[PDB]
Every structure is written in structure tokens, then in C-alpha cells.
Amino acid sequence: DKMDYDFKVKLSSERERVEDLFEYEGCKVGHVYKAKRKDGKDDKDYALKQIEGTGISMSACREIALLRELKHPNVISLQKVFLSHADRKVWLLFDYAEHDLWHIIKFHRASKLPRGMVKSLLYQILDGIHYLHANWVLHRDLKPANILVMGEGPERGRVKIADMGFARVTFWYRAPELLLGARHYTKAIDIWAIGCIFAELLTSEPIFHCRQNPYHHDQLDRIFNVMGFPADKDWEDIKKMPEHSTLMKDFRRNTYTNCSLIKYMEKHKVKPDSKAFHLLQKLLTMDPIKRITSEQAMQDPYFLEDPLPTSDVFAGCQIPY
Amino acid sequence: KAMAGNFWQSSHYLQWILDKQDLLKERQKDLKFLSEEEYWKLQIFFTNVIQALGEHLKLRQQVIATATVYFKRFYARYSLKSIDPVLMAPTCVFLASKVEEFGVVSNTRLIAAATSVLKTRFSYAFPKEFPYRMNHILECEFYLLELMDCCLIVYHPYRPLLQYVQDMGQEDMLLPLAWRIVNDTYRTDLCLLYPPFMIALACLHVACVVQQKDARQWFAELSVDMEKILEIIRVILKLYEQWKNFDERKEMATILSKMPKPKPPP
Numbered sequence: 408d409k410m411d412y413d414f415k416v417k418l419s420s421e422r423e424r425v426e427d428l429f430e431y432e433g434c435k436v437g438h439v440y441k442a443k444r445k446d447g448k449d450d451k452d453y454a455l456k457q458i459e460g461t462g463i464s465m466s467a468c469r470e471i472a473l474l475r476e477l478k479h480p481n482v483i484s485l486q487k488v489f490l491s492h493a494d495r496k497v498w499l500l501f502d503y504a505e506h507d508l509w510h511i512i513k514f515h516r517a518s519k520l521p522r523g524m525v526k527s528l529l530y531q532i533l534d535g536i537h538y539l540h541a542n543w544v545l546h547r548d549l550k551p552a553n554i555l556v557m558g559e560g561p562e563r564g565r566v567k568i569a570d571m572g573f574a575r576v577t578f579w580y581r582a583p584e585l586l587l588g589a590r591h592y593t594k595a596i597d598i599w600a601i602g603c604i605f606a607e608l609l610t611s612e613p614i615f616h617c618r619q620n621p622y623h624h625d626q627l628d629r630i631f632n633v634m635g636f637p638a639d640k641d642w643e644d645i646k647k648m649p650e651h652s653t654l655m656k657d658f659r660r661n662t663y664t665n666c667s668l669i670k671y672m673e674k675h676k677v678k679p680d681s682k683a684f685h686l687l688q689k690l691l692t693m694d695p696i697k698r699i700t701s702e703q704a705m706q707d708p709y710f711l712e713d714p715l716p717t718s719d720v721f722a723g724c725q726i727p728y
Numbered sequence: 729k730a731m732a733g734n735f736w737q738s739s740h741y742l743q744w745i746l747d748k749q750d751l752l753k754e755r756q757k758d759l760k761f762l763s764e765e766e767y768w769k770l771q772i773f774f775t776n777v778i779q780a781l782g783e784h785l786k787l788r789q790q791v792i793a794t795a796t797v798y799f800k801r802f803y804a805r806y807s808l809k810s811i812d813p814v815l816m817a818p819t820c821v822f823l824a825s826k827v828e829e830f831g832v833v834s835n836t837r838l839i840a841a842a843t844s845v846l847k848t849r850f851s852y853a854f855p856k857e858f859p860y861r862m863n864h865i866l867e868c869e870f871y872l873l874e875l876m877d878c879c880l881i882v883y884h885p886y887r888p889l890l891q892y893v894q895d896m897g898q899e900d901m902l903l904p905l906a907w908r909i910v911n912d913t914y915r916t917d918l919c920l921l922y923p924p925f926m927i928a929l930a931c932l933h934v935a936c937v938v939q940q941k942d943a944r945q946w947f948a949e950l951s952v953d954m955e956k957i958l959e960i961i962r963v964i965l966k967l968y969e970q971w972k973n974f975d976e977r978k979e980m981a982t983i984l985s986k987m988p989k990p991k992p993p994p
């Protein structure tokens with residue numbers, strides 16, 4: 408080794424190692440572990456993620472670079488990065504989020520979601536994404552599994568947006584422009600996913616649920632069965648999409664004539680004249696330039712209507728999950 | 729671009745705007761081997777090496793700038809003997825390229841670029857060929873990340889400069905010169921001591937003086953401490969006199985021989 412000896416040995420003597428500070432024997436919930444401090448002067452649960460691959464890949468660099476700078480109550484906090492020099496592995500440390508929205512929804516789909524909780528989930532997701540968007544950071548993979556929620560403790564019921572598959576399949580939350588071959592991720596694509604999540608919170612079922620390169624026929628079909636087929640006035644630049652020709656070849660407007668978001672939400676007991684529905688409709692707009700922004704959505708009168716959103720999404724209730 | 733407008737709560741601002749006295753105190757270790765003059769010559773030299781590496785790899789100026797800041801941060805804390813700067817330079821370019829979302833320079837392309845650049849542009853200083861391989865880059869990368877405490881997003885004066893000249897309505901007259909002066913500030917400690925916007929203002933002022941443009945009124949109606957700007961202007965004015973007096977190609981072999989070198993295992 409050509410590096411200074413005294414420099415090397417000093418750093419190795421002082422270097423924090425994950426295996427010294429944390430007990431993660433099993434608890435394998437790359438790979439993510441539930442961890443406890445070995446020191447004992449700490450009873451809080453932590454999550455440890457070992458980055459997949461050796462060293463630091465593009466996505467890994469980016470995840471670290473962004474999380475290091477990002478600071479908002481509804482975006483998961485990076486507490487620490489451990490650099491394992493012998494095996495060149497990277498570890499990320501976070502506070503453990505007891506719950507996530509995929510298990511929360513599954514629980515309610517199985518027992519069958521309180522309305523106060525739905526609103527507060529939506530508000531906090533929007534808050535977090537608004538912060539990301541204002542800093543020109545796009546999530547690009549919003550879905551219930553990526554919406555964490557803190558359990559008992561000082562952050563009870565606080566949403567934490569995560570991106571647990573940042574390195575890299577369900578298309579239920581993908582905006583139609585991506586299914587028609589759009590080449591760039593956008594803020595609007597995130598907003599469409601949020602709309603999908605909101606609908607799912609309101610009904611307990613994924614609104615664009617579909618059986619398992621960018622063109623995905625069955626997924627678009629499911630979107631049209633729910634939304635109807637867009638008129639040219641609804642999405643004027645749909646004809647600029649790379650797969651537009653394919654769409655014309657595969658689909659006919661007439662197939663979806665009796666379909667609309669109003670009719671879909673009606674058979675799931677959600678009222679079309681509700682402030683909830685009108686917000687949802689502004690989020691699930693087919694044309695991405697006609698979608699509401701995250702900030703516009705936070706200002707919606709839905710959030711001024713009784714009941715107000717709460718910082719603890721479980722507020723006024725107990726946690727059965 | 730990511731985290732634009734977040735400077736005041738950024739890791740750059742909160743952890744990596746250093747105190748000058750702290751900086752010079754840590755530098756005293758190396759100043760037992762090199763005079764102060766030789767130290768600022770060495771800095772000019774490695775700035776140029778990193779710029780050459782960047783140009784060869786066809787990286788945008790912002791990536792080169794980020795790489796240059798990584799290099800400065802490392803040696804702001806540690807002695808030149810800790811890790812060979814010839815190894816650290818290309819390691820910084822490699823990490824910055826990944827962080828700035830330009831790409832992962834391939835193994836063979838990174839090593840080929842360092843080998844070629846040292847041989848073609850710097851043979852006066854390096855008669856032997858670049859001796860390092862990718863395993864050394866990867867080991868160095870880990871030491872670099874550790875030292876920087878994973879603080880990877882770096883702000884630079886180019887963006888604010890762009891906004892300032894657009895406001896003046898002097899994009900075509902003053903931008904090329906002021907941008908070039910910004911590049912030259914990386915030959916100094918300025919990026920460790922001042923927010924980028926201040927450096928932008930200092931560079932623009934110097935550009936105005938050089939091109940005989942009256943912009944007094946414009947500068948007068950800014951809400952910034954002009955004392956700080958004037959400190960920055962004096963360093964810029966000085967760097968051109970230093971540039972004039974420094975013959976890099978004649979001096980660097982001797983200066984590099986004076987650098988403290990890594991102690992071997994005992």
C-alpha cells in the first residue's frame with residue numbers, strides 16, 4: 408500500500424464499524440435489518456441497509472448525496488453512513504418505521520380506513536413530496552410500500568417517505584405517459600402515483616390493479632376501464648408520445664364509453680360531490696400538464712373541511728396493526 | 729438541478745465553509761517541508777491536473793469543479809503525505825462524475841485518462857507513468873467519502889453568476905470573462921472560505937473592471953457585505969500576479985520532490 412502508514416492505522420483505530428455499534432443478529436426484515444444499539448443507552452429501534460454491490464454505484468452515490476442534504480419531517484432521515492473498508496460495503500442507518508402503507512391497507516382490506524387518517528396520510532405524503540419537488544428531487548417510484556409510518560414514540564403516526572428500491576414488478580402506480588413511452592421522469596408522474604395512493608386509501612383496493620418495453624397494454628386498458636378513454640381535448644399532446652400509434656392500433660374509444668372516475672368511485676361508496684373526490688380527480692388527470700401540483704393540492708379545501716389533518720395520522724384512535 | 733436553492737441549510741454551508749485560521753493551523757504540518765509560496769504553487773498545479781483530467785474525459789465544468797472541491801477538502805484536513813495527490817486527483821474526478829449524474833467512468837477509461845494526461849500535459853513533473861490501478865482508486869474513494877462525511881453535493885459560483893449577468897443584461901459582454909475568472913478562483917482557498925454567490929460577485933466585479941464597464945450602481949443596490957466581496961477581489965487580483973510570477977513547468981519537479989511522502993510500514 409502506498410498510503411501513509413500512520414494515517415492508515417490511526418483511521419482504522421478510530422473508525423466506527425456497524426458490527427460494533429449494532430446488534431442485527433437475524434431480524435432481516437440489498438438487505439434491510441432491524442437493529443438495536445449494543446451500547447444500551449438507547450431503546451429505540453433502527454433499520455440498517457447494506458447497499459447491494461461492492462463500493463459505491465451511481466444510484467448509491469446519489470442516494471447518499473441526496474439523503475445527506477434532505478431534511479423534512481415526512482422524508483426518512485439518514486442517521487449515519489458506515490463504510491466497511493475490509494469488504495468495501497456501505498451501510499445506511501435510519502430510525503425504524505414500525506408501519507408501512509402496504510400493510511396498513513392490506514389490514515383494512517382484510518378486516519373489511521378511518522377518514523381522518525386517510526386525509527392525514529395524504530397531507531403528509533404531499534408535504535414530503537412538495538419539499539422534494541421544491542428541491543428538484545423526483546421520487547420516481549411512489550407506492551404504498553414506500554410510504555412508511557412511525558409507531559409509538561416521539562414521532563407517532565408521522566409519515567416517512569422512503570425509496571427502498573432506488574437502485575433498480577408492479578405498474579399500478581405508473582402514469583400513462585410513461586406507459587406510452589415518455590422519456591423523462593417528471594413531478595407530474597409523482598403526482599399521479601399520489602393520486603393512485605389516495606384512491607386506494609379511500610377504497611382499500613388499488614385503483615389500477617392489473618395482472619402481471621415501456622408500452623404495457625393491459626395496464627393502459629385497466630386505466631381506461633376506470634378513467635374512460637381520453638378525448639383529444641383532454642390530452643392534446645398525447646399524439647407526441649412515442650407509443651401513440653401503438654395505442655391507436657390496439658385501442659378503440661368505444662370500448663370505454665360507459666367508463667369514468669365518477670362511475671368507478673361511485674361503486675366504491677365514495678361520493679362524487681365530496682371534496683375528497685374533487686381533489687382525487689385533479690390528481691388523476693391523464694394529461695400531465697393538467698395535473699395539480701403538490702403545493703396546489705395542499706391548498707385544496709379538502710384539507711380545511713372537518714376533520715383537519717393531524718401530525719399523528721393515528722390521532723383520535725389506537726393502532727391495531 | 730437537485731438541491732438548488734438549499735445552500736443555507738446544506739452540508740456545504742453548515743460543515744464545509746471553513747475558518748481560515750483553522751485551515752492554516754492544519755496546514756502548518758506541511759509547511760515544515762514546503763514554504764507558503766511552494767504550497768500555493770502546488771495547489772495551482774493540482775487544480776490544473778484535475779482540469780486536464782476533466783477535459784480529457786469531456787466532463788462539464790461543474791463536475792470538474794466538484795472534483796476540485798473534494799480534493800481541497802481532503803488536504804484541508806490531512807497532510808499531502810497521507811495519500812498521494814496523484815492518486816487522489818483522479819479519484820476525485822471519478823466520484824464527482826458519479827455524484828453529478830454524468831456517469832461511472834469505466835475502469836479502463838479512468839486509468840487510461842490519468843495515464844495519458846500525466847504523460848502528455850505533465851511530463852515535466854512526472855517522468856514515470858501513472859503507477860496506479862483501479863483497486864487503488866476504489867480504496868482511495870472510500871477514504872475520500874469518509875473524510876468528507878459523505879457530504880457530496882457542492883455548490884459553485886457559476887449558477888449565481890449566470891443569474892447576476894442576466895439581471896445586468898450583459899450576458900454577451902461579461903459572461904465569458906467572469907466565468908473564466910470563476911474557474912481561476914479554484915487555484916486558491918476561496919471555495920473553502922466563502923459562499924459561492926460572493927465569489928460570483930467578486931469575479932463579476934473584476935470582469936467589469938477589466939472590460940471598463942460601469943456597474944457601480946448595480947453593485948451598490950445589493951444587500952451583501954461588500955467588505956467580504958473586497959477580500960475576495962484582493963485574492964483574485966493577487967492570483968493573477970502569482971500566475972505571472974510562477975513558471976509551473978520549470979518549478980514543479982523540484983517542488984514535488986519537497987512534498988512530504990508517505991511513511992512505509994515499519
Ligand SMILES: CNC(=O)c1cc(Oc2ccc(NC(=O)Nc3ccc(Cl)c(C(F)(F)F)c3)cc2)ccn1
Nearest residue numbers: 439454456470501502503504505568569570571573
Ligand atoms: C417496516 N419498516 C421498514 O420496512 C423500514 C425500512 C427501512 O429501510 C429503508 C431502506 C432504505 C431507504 N432508503 C431510501 O429511502 N433512500 C432514498 C433515496 C432517494 C430518495 Cl429521493 C429518497 C427520498 F427522498 F425519496 F425519500 C430516499 C429507506 C428506508 C427503514 C425503516 N423502516
